[PDB]
Amino acid sequence: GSSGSSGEQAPGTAPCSRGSSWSADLDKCMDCASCRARPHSDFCLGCAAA
């Protein structure tokens, strides 16, 4: 309705869904939505081969 996007630590235990990458620096998984505008991401760069 108003608030309810994250939920009960949904992504807590479970890994990141196809699209997002784990970010040790931010101890959280970032979504591509950030890589698209910011390709200088380490969570997607250090994780991906290239």
Curated annotation (Swiss-Prot):
Induction: By FGF1 and phorbol ester.
Tissue: Highly expressed in heart, placenta and kidney. Intermediate expression in lung, skeletal muscle and pancreas.
Name used for this protein in its record: Tumor necrosis factor receptor superfamily member 12A
Extracellular topology ranges: 8-50
Species this protein is from: Homo sapiens
Subunit architecture: Associates with TRAF1 and TRAF2, and probably also with TRAF3.
Function, as annotated: Receptor for TNFSF12/TWEAK. Weak inducer of apoptosis in some cell types. Promotes angiogenesis and the proliferation of endothelial cells. May modulate cellular adhesion to matrix proteins.
A cellular component annotation (GO) from this entry: ruffle
GO BP annotations, alphabetical order: angiogenesis; cell differentiation; extrinsic apoptotic signaling pathway; positive regulation of apoptotic process; positive regulation of axon extension; positive regulation of extrinsic apoptotic signaling pathway; regulation of angiogenesis; regulation of wound healing
Keyword annotations: Angiogenesis, Apoptosis, Cell adhesion, Developmental protein, Differentiation, Disulfide bond, Membrane, Receptor, Signal, Transmembrane, Transmembrane helix
Residue range from the parent sequence: 28 to 70 of 129
Disulfide bond among keywords: yes
Sequence ranges of the TNFR-Cys repeats: 16-47
Disulfide-linked positions: C16-C29, C32-C47, C35-C44
Cellular compartment(s): Membrane
Highest rank taxon of the organism: Eukaryota
